[PDB]
Design a protein around this ligand. Structure first.
Ligand SMILES: [Mg+2]
Ligand SMILES: [Mg+2]
Ligand SMILES: [Mg+2]
Ligand SMILES: [Mg+2]
Length: 102
RNA sequence: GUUCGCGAAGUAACCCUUCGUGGACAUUUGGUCAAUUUGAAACAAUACAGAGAUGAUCAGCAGUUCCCCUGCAUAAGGAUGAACCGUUUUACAAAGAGAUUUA
């Protein structure tokens, strides 16, 4: 049991997004360079604007999905426990935090 | 202007006066700045509030700050000098079920 370290958590997050990129290519397949300017020193990479848009969309979708999966957790945990005496929400979140200690 | 020469005129008798002409002496101040409104002090007054830890009443001492003010100050005081008192979501996974799809 126990917790998962950050180097093991990062690999599992990297393994998970590779399966999201695998099925994204499978759902697409189901439906149907390097230039180095010598004067400036800058390196320009030419890439597809669709794959850059799909990168920007999927990060926003994962940002909203974790935002909504946490918002429902806020609305559920506020309306679970009311037995022990509280005063405000920061007291409830602290007295619940004492319960996970024991 | 002074002084050292030189030349001419007059008085002289080689000295004085006069005006011509070479030298020498002395040689570069001040402003970062213009004299009332438009290149910048600040108080006071009026209005509106009105002193931290509190259940009430009383001492304070710090800290953080791209706020300082008094003071000789590395002392101390400025309400414990003031401001602080809010807003708060992703380093995120692993297991186990029902609806909607796909081709
Ligand atoms: Mg006091
Ligand atoms: Mg006092
Ligand atoms: Mg203080
Ligand atoms: Mg003080």
């Amino acid at each position: 049991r126990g917790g998962i370290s950050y180097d093991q958590l990062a690999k599992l997050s990297y393994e998970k997004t590779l399966r999201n990129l695998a099925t994204q290519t499978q759902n697409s397949s189901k439906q149907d360079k390097v230039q180095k300017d010598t004067k400036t020193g800058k390196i320009t990479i030419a890439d597809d604007d669709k794959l850059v848009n799909k990168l920007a969309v999927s990060l926003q979708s994962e940002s909203k999905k974790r935002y909504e999966a946490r918002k429902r957790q806020m609305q559920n945990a506020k309306t679970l426990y009311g037995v022990e005496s509280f005063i405000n929400d920061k007291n409830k979140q602290f007295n619940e935090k004492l319960s996970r200690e024991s």
